[PDB]
Amino acid sequence: APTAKLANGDTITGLNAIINEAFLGIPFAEPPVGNLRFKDPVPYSGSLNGQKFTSYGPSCMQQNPEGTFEENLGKTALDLVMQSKVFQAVLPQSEDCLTINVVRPPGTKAGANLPVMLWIFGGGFEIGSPTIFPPAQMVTKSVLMGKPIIHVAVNYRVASWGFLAGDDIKAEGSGNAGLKDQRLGMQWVADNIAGFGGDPSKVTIFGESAGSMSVLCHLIWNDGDNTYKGKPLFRAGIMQSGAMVPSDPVDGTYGNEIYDLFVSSAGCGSASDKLACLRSASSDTLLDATNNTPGFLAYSSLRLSYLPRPDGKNITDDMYKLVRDGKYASVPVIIGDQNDEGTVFGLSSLNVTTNAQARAYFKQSFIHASDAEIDTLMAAYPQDITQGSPFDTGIFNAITPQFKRISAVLGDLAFIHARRYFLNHFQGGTKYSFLSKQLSGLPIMGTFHANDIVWQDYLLGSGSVIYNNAFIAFATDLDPNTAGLLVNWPKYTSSSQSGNNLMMINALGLYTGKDNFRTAGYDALMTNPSSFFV
Ligand SMILES: CCCCC/C=C\C/C=C\CCCCCCCC(=O)O[C@H]1CC[C@@]2(C)C(=CC[C@H]3[C@@H]4CC[C@H]([C@H](C)CCCC(C)C)[C@@]4(C)CC[C@@H]32)C1
Ligand SMILES: *[C@@H]1O[C@H](CO)[C@@H](O[C@@H]2O[C@H](CO)[C@@H](O)[C@H](O)[C@H]2NC(C)=O)[C@H](O)[C@H]1NC(C)=O
Ligand SMILES: *[C@@H]1O[C@H](CO)[C@@H](O)[C@H](O)[C@H]1NC(C)=O
Numbered sequence: 222a223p224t225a226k227l228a229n230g231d232t233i234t235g236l237n238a239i240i241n242e243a244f245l246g247i248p249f250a251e252p253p254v255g256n257l258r259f260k261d262p263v264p265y266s267g268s269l270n271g272q273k274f275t276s277y278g279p280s281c282m283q284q285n286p287e288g289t290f291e292e293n294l295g296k297t298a299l300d301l302v303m304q305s306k307v308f309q310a311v312l313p314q315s316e317d318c319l320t321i322n323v324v325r326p327p328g329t330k331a332g333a334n335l336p337v338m339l340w341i342f343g344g345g346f347e348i349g350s351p352t353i354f355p356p357a358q359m360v361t362k363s364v365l366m367g368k369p370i371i372h373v374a375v376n377y378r379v380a381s382w383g384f385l386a387g388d389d390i391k392a393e394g395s396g397n398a399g400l401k402d403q404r405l406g407m408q409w410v411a412d413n414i415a416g417f418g419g420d421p422s423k424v425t426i427f428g429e430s431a432g433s434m435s436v437l438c439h440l441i442w443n444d445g446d447n448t449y450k451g452k453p454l455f456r457a458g459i460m461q462s463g464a465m466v467p468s469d470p471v472d473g474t475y476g477n478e479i480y481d482l483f484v485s486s487a488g489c490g491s492a493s494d495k496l497a498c499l500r501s502a503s504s505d506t507l508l509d510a511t512n513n514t515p516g517f518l519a520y521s522s523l524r525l526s527y528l529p530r531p532d533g534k535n536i537t538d539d540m541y542k543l544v545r546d547g548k549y550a551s552v553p554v555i556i557g558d559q560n561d562e563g564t565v566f567g568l569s570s571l572n573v574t575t576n577a578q579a580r581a582y583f584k585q586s587f588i589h590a591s592d593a594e595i596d597t598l599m600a601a602y603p604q605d606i607t608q609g610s611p612f613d614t615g616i617f618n619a620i621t622p623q624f625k626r627i628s629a630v631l632g633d634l635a636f637i638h639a640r641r642y643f644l645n646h647f648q649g650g651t652k653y654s655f656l657s658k659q660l661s662g663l664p665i666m667g668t669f670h671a672n673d674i675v676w677q678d679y680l681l682g683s684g685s686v687i688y689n690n691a692f693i694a695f696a697t698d699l700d701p702n703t704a705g706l707l708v709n710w711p712k713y714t715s716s717s718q719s720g721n722n723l724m725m726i727n728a729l730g731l732y733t734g735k736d737n738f739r740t741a742g743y744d745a746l747m748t749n750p751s752s753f754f755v
Contacts (some may be wrong), residue, residue: 225323226331226416231270237327241360241698244323244417246278246540249409253378257506258500259385260395261317262405275702280350281318283625284380288516290482297611300512304364305628306453312352316504320376321406323417324356326369333369333418336425336696339410339455340374341403342673343430343463345517346528347380355678362689366704368697371419375406381511384527387480389496391472397531400438404488407439407454427695430671431528433463433556437643438529445555445649446677447550457699459692460556461673462636464643465540469754471532479526487508522569523585523635524755542749544646552697554647555692555725556640556653561610561667563632567624576604579635583630590752594745601745602630611667618665624700629742631671634753638743642737642750645715652713653701654736655724684726691724700716706730 223235225244229618235244247269248263257263264476281732285303287295289542302308308562329335338359342349343690351374361368377383383399411421422462436458439447447454469475484495487510490626492498499507515521531538558585583595589597589755604606607615609625612631644652661669677688694704701710708731713722719735 224287227269228412228416229268229375233269233271233274236275239327240356240357241327242329244274244327245475246274246277246320246576248278248319249321249375250319253319253382253398254316256500257278258316258382259390259398259496261398261401264405268693269488272502277322277350277352278320279313279315279318280352281378282316282374282380282382282504282511283316283349284347284516285512286345286348286516286518288514289510289519289521290513290515296512302385308680309524312350316382318319318376318378319402320347321409322374322376323414324360324372325418326360326364326371329369329371329418331416331418332406334415334420334423335369335418336423336694337371337410337414337421338420338692339372339407339424339426340372341377341426341428341432341435342374342437343432343505344379344382344400345430345515346431346525347429351376354674357695358678358681359689366690368693368694368703369415370693370696371414372411373414373419375403377402377406381483381507381514384470384529385480385483385608386476386530388472388477390480391470391532393496394532394534396652397529397535399436400529400535401444403435404439404442408449411449411452411454422452422456423696425459427459427461427692428524429461430463434459434466435462435642438466438536440552440649441543442535444543444548445550447552453550453552455550455552457537457552457695459552459695460554460640461688462558462562462670464468464531464556464636464639465544465750467528467634467754468528468751469540469640471530473530474526475755476530482514483510486513517566520569520571521586522566523631528755539751539754541642544643549647551649553650553695553746554699555655555695556643557638557657557666558637559670559672560612560656560658561628561632561635562564562670563610563630563722564666565627566631567610567628570627571621571624573627575623579604579623579626582627585697586755587753594749598630598745601739601741602626602633611663611665613661614667618667620665620712631744633674633739635706636670638739641716641743642747643747644713644736645753651699653695653710653712654713654722654735655687655726656734657684657687657726659726659728661727682731683728686731687726688725708733
């Protein structure tokens, strides 16, 4: 019964879920299969008139997080689970996965002109899909606050299929395919969303983790040109854990190293035209090859095999440099973090137990860093177990003498101080920042990376007034304060400003604070960001 009219005039039918109306599995691009593998997506051209969209399509192919070229039980066990029929029955995957999803308040009709919140899932640029991030909580809340919004989730290619790099990809101009899928989805929204009751001039893009870093990539995309048909694609962005990607270009050292290993595992090591050889390999061969390169939970940890990289075309340069140079879209922004971002990633190196070992690991991970730089970093992030993450836990959580130390560095470099760097240089619009400590006390993990997904999509907690209410107010009014919070959210200007510039969250509620913690670490990492690029 719920129906919507697309830009071409097609009339589609959806699912009435009582609490909302969903249109799930709408294709937005041609299947990037066979000879279209690794290439920019192609707009869908067929007709959908008369078709019904009542269920989530399959996720793009997924890389085993324990994947690696070494043989280990974690990799194997994980393969057994993902490849099992029950798992494949619950969470199906396919290379034919470029679909978009629209969920709206009950009774919405075209012409409602409601703000749109476009969700970009995260998953290490290696796993994930819109299916595991239910929008009901966000949609119900916007109705209750009398500020209804339309939730749009776009699917995009992950791992090798969406982020293969190296000299061949570069030469062909096929870099950052997965970000191009997201960019096409945004154009699909600009063209079609009105028919669903949405206002295309009121789009706020938001994502968590790799999805958050994706949001930043969209601000600096095409050197800050976010227009399509002369109009902005989005008017605001929200970043939940992640800003700049600390990465070398598509044709750099590790981009080629991973590419060579992928090609060899694919059995294309002898082809003179390896891309052509990859494009005709079976789906299982490419899957096995991908799982033979390191996954995000493997020892390599955040030194990712697949991630966005400057390609000289769409991401014209070092992302830190682009933000420093003013090459971004001029939109207001909300960016925040979870107190203990690094704890899950610190679990990947529990065999690093001595200071010498920790030094070697950092050396191995940051190939452009000098001894002197590695020295300043290890001085700024001491072995002292009270200093590490989970933060403020004293002598607790010391699985090994380096765990808390390694966790602190990874979380700061990848998420926390990267956020500070962004806020100190971004002058494109009003900035608001938050820091959550909602789970202080949770053994080992603390206020871990991605716990915000639980409070935003699954359960109500103290953080939910931020993750739902505050975000919906921002999408609607460009000010999180219209949410009617008990604590005013102060604008952020710089980390060295006078008073409180951070909205904080604890188990009891909100309070404000300052973004002035671990400044030695910030200087050790952000003085010359590129020294720590992967
Ligand atoms: C030492 C090496 C060099 C150091 C590093 C240097 C540079 C770093 C460069 C890049 C870093 C980029 C990292 C990007 C992303 C990190 C990877 C990541 O895990 O994300 C995760 C981000 C969140 C995300 C999307 C992931 C997987 C599945 C998701 C879950 C499935 C289920 C669960 C629900 C909450 C379950 C319901 C629960 C109940 C109780 C109701 C979900 C949705 C929580 C959120 C999860 C991946
Ligand atoms: C911790 O374990 C990792 C993973 O097993 C070790 O790294 C591997 O070590 C073997 C043997 O030296 C090498 O063949 C692999 O190439 C390494 N893999 C990677 C991804 O680096 C690591 O040496 C161990 N760390 C310590 C301090 O002992
Ligand atoms: C990427 O950059 C090229 C070169 O400027 C441009 O022609 C192309 O449209 C861009 N792609 C996207 C998806 O914006």
